[PDB]
Amino acid sequence: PINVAIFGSTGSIGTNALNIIRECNKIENVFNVKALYVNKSVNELYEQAREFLPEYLCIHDKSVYEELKELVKNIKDYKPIILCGDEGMKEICSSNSIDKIVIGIDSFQGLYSTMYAIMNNKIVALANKESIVSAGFFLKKLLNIHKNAKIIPVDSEHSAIFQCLDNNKVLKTKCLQDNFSKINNINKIFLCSSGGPFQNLTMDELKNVTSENALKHPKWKMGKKITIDSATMMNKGLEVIETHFLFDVDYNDIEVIVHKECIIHSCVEFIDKSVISQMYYPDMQIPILYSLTWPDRIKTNLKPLDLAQVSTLTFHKPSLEHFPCIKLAYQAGIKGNFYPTVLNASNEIANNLFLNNKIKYFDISSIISQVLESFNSQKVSENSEDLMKQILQIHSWAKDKATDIYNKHN
Amino acid sequence: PINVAIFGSTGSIGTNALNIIRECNKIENVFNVKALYVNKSVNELYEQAREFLPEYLCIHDKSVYEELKELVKNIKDYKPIILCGDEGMKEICSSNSIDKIVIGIDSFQGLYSTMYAIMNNKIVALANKESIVSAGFFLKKLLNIHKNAKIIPVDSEHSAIFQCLDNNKVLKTKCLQDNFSKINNINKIFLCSSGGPFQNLTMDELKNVTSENALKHPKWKMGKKITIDSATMMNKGLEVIETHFLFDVDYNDIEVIVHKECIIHSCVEFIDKSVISQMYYPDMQIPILYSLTWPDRIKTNLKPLDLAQVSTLTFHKPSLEHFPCIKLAYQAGIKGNFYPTVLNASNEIANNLFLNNKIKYFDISSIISQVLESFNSQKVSENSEDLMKQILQIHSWAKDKATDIYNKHN
Ligand SMILES: CN(O)C(=O)C[C@@H](CCCCc1ccccc1)CP(=O)(O)O
Ligand SMILES: CN(O)C(=O)C[C@@H](CCCCc1ccccc1)CP(=O)(O)O
Numbered sequence: 001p002i003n004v005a006i007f008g009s010t011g012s013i014g015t016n017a018l019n020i021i022r023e024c025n026k027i028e029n030v031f032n033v034k035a036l037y038v039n040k041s042v043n044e045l046y047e048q049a050r051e052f053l054p055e056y057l058c059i060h061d062k063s064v065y066e067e068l069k070e071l072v073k074n075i076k077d078y079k080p081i082i083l084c085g086d087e088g089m090k091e092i093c094s095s096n097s098i099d100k101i102v103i104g105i106d107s108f109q110g111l112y113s114t115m116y117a118i119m120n121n122k123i124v125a126l127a128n129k130e131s132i133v134s135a136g137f138f139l140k141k142l143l144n145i146h147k148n149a150k151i152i153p154v155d156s157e158h159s160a161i162f163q164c165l166d167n168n169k170v171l172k173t174k175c176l177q178d179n180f181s182k183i184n185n186i187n188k189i190f191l192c193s194s195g196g197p198f199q200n201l202t203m204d205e206l207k208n209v210t211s212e213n214a215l216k217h218p219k220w221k222m223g224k225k226i227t228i229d230s231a232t233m234m235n236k237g238l239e240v241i242e243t244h245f246l247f248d249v250d251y252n253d254i255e256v257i258v259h260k261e262c263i264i265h266s267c268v269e270f271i272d273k274s275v276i277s278q279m280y281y282p283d284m285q286i287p288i289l290y291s292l293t294w295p296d297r298i299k300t301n302l303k304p305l306d307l308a309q310v311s312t313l314t315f316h317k318p319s320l321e322h323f324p325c326i327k328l329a330y331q332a333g334i335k336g337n338f339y340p341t342v343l344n345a346s347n348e349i350a351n352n353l354f355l356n357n358k359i360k361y362f363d364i365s366s367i368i369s370q371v372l373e374s375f376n377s378q379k380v381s382e383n384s385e386d387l388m389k390q391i392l393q394i395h396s397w398a399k400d401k402a403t404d405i406y407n408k409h410n
Numbered sequence: 411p412i413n414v415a416i417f418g419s420t421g422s423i424g425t426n427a428l429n430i431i432r433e434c435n436k437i438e439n440v441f442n443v444k445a446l447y448v449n450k451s452v453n454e455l456y457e458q459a460r461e462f463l464p465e466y467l468c469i470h471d472k473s474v475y476e477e478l479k480e481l482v483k484n485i486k487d488y489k490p491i492i493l494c495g496d497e498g499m500k501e502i503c504s505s506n507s508i509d510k511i512v513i514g515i516d517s518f519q520g521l522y523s524t525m526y527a528i529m530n531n532k533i534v535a536l537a538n539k540e541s542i543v544s545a546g547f548f549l550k551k552l553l554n555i556h557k558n559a560k561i562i563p564v565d566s567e568h569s570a571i572f573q574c575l576d577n578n579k580v581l582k583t584k585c586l587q588d589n590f591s592k593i594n595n596i597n598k599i600f601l602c603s604s605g606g607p608f609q610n611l612t613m614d615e616l617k618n619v620t621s622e623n624a625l626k627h628p629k630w631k632m633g634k635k636i637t638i639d640s641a642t643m644m645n646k647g648l649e650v651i652e653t654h655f656l657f658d659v660d661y662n663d664i665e666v667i668v669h670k671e672c673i674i675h676s677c678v679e680f681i682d683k684s685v686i687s688q689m690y691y692p693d694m695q696i697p698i699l700y701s702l703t704w705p706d707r708i709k710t711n712l713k714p715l716d717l718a719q720v721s722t723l724t725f726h727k728p729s730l731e732h733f734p735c736i737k738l739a740y741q742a743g744i745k746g747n748f749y750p751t752v753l754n755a756s757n758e759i760a761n762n763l764f765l766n767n768k769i770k771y772f773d774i775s776s777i778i779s780q781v782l783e784s785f786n787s788q789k790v791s792e793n794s795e796d797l798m799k800q801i802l803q804i805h806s807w808a809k810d811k812a813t814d815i816y817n818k819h820n
């Protein structure tokens with residue numbers, strides 16, 4: 001039985017995780033949902049508790065802690081450990097009855113819960129790409145100290161890559177470990193992208209696009225931040241750095257390819273030049289499930305891929321003139337040091353400004369570029385705690401710097 | 411070092427094997443070619459021996475055994491064991507210095523040499539799909555008795571399938587074994603086909619196509635027999651049965667899909683519905699190489715797949731009305747017993763009649779159908795020697811039946 005905790009259980013990743021766990025458990029009882037952690041949606045947490053009856057419940061917002069305890073009293077024959085805040089999160093991570101943790105939280109609390117999951121030697125299904133891009137150095141250091149901890153990618157493209165590999169070799173290494181690509185015989189990565197809602201706009205059309213325009217995607221419904229990142233292709237920029245860190249693949253060996261049908265989720269070229277790819281309909285249940293079953297697979301009742309009906313798959317190179325964010329991401333990764341931290345942070349601000357109609361499309365890449373230009377590389381701290389603090393400081397500096405550039409151009 | 415013997419070294423598969431071995435060895439000294447076995451082409455064998463300097467040479471045709479001994483005297487620091495006929499082949503199979511054997515021989519010397527390779531617990535890279543189709547029961551029994559022997563597929567689609575698997579799981583079983591699909595969590599197979607030269611043709615056009623029409627394949631210059639099979643789609647029919655035997659996949663779980671670009675070589679749907687596929691330009695060097703390196707990969711200098719340049723991949727269902735051979739193959743496979751033997755044998759005759767302009771396109775499937783209609787299941791011999799004779803007898807009977815049908819009609 002797979003004992004799992006879901007962090008951010010009412011968010012998109014969390015709800016998809018619970019959906020596929022429910023459906024798979026109907027086929028065969030494989031999963032015990034041992035813990036649920038949510039921010040403030042106490043009614044939904046209660047509804048989830050009613051169904052999954054986890055040993056642990058944690059709600060981040062203390063102001064509804066008391067409300068949750070009262071709600072849970074309605075549930076027959078059920079006496080969970082009910083917790084609150086950051087320390088409830090640490091307590092869940094320290095439990096011996098939990099093997100795997102799904103991190104479906106963004107920003108700080110994402111990195112924070114990830115850190116604690118690793119320190120407790122857990123298998124960590126990580127869906128927060130920003131944490132890998134921003135804190136890749138720290139995660140690598142932590143995984144070197146906590147040798148039985150493992151990060152398993154949930155981001156769809158990185159799951160695809162992971163699935164294309166031979167588990168016989170994967171089991172001799174782990175994500176974020178030096179030599180991962182060498183041990184797995186990886187030569188090159190094709191990172192497939194939907195291309196976003198602006199993929200066929202002219203330069204003139206791009207100058208004027210608004211977030212309202214973007215918040216209508218050609219394939220999926222998602223959170224606002226990632227939708228904007230998909231529109232600028234900074235999402236794929238972030239995913240390039242994520243690939244580099246997860247799989248130890250050199251930047252000149254990662255190619256972004258636009259695949260508008262979203263059936264092939266990414267491909268791996270091995271040293272013999274054979275290419276393996278993973279395919280399915282656009283659906284996050286597959287990557288989430290695999291992160292929890294790896295290195296095995298279990299049955300689902302998902303709709304089988306009908307290739308003949310899909311009929312046609314297309315691929316083209318993205319225009320770096322139209323999607324300059326892709327270029328900035330490569331430049332920042334190749335530069336190394338903490339440039340990815342700065343890229344991530346400055347993008348956070350620029351994405352939000354465009355979201356809220358404060359700047360235009362090309363101002364996004366302009367602002368990020370100027371912040372990157374501005375940064376000066378730093379000696380990387382050897383101590384893991386100092387390194388974490390250094391990352392946070394650079395992150396905060398870069399957000400402030402972006403904001404100041406905005407305020408200059410008003 | 412990988413110690414390999416090439417059986418049929420001057421045929422298509424044999425020459426491709428030596429070419430990729432040569433090229434890979436330039437990059438890293440990986441392979442020792444320990445034995446070469448050819449039928450009659452004593453000059454070419456001499457040329458190969460000069461380059462590869464194998465410990466063993468065998469020529470099947472005894473009449474040129476002496477010419478071979480004399481020719482090799484021209485080679486300076488070289489003292490090979492020179493053999494001939496079946497006994498040389500057997501002596502090679504029994505060598506403890508030989509790990510893997512590429513069987514690039516057709517019909518029955520192919521099967522006979524496979525049998526001896528298996529009896530000597532070798533790894534057998536098998537390219538002869540007709541032997542798996544016709545003698546699958548026999549190979550299965552022989553592999554159950556000789557536990558360390560393994561067949562590794564070389565047929566491009568079956569190699570693709572094999573490459574999509576986790577060797578982690580593969581190493582717990584082996585091809586042509588009961589439960590192979592269960593252990594590897596396989597649900598379903600997409601077997602990709604070029605579709606041959608006639609996919610767009612009407613039924614009325616198909617009535618009158620000729621072998622000269624068929625022998626201009628849209629994608630690959632190959633032997634005449636397989637070219638005709640690709641035209642009728644009997645090639646895929648045979649490969650469906652090959653899939654069933656190699657991977658223990660039920661017939662209802664094998665779908666033939668027409669993929670004219672011949673980039674995706676086949677796909678495996680796992681029990682979670684995730685699909686993994688193998689991709690490359692049409693080239694037989696990758697499947698051959700993988701059969702020799704499995705479960706590892708080695709570097710090549712093959713041209714990298716350029717997906718953006720490829721640009722478009724298409725897929726459609728084959729019409730069983732237009733390609734009735736596909737339907738007959740499934741029917742024979744589903745029927746089981748020795749029906750696949752009968753299918754293969756009658757096709758051998760029908761294919762050749764069509765090739766030589768003695769019958770028309772739909773006469774191929776008509777003759778095959780009538781031979782199958784005429785066969786009745788037989789008790790399967792328990793004894794491996796009796797079983798082999800049963801297969802040969804049925805094969806011979808089916809060829810005679812097909813011939814007598816043609817003769818009646820003519
Ligand atoms: C899903 N995923 O990993 C993402 O980063 C979101 C996609 C945009 C959604 C594409 C449609 C889709 C594919 C697979 C799974 C769910 C949705 C970003 P991109 O392809 O536009 O770069
Ligand atoms: C190669 N192979 O395994 C074959 O059975 C030959 C192909 C026809 C040639 C397609 C082009 C090709 C693909 C892969 C490797 C070499 C050539 C048969 P089919 O696709 O027409 O059924």
Ligand SMILES: [Ca+2]
Pocket residue numbers: 162163164165166167574575576
């Ligand atoms: Ca795999």
Ligand SMILES: [Mn+2]
Pocket residue numbers: 155156157239
């Ligand atoms: Mn993604």
Ligand SMILES: [Mn+2]
Pocket residue numbers: 565566567649
């Ligand atoms: Mn084939």
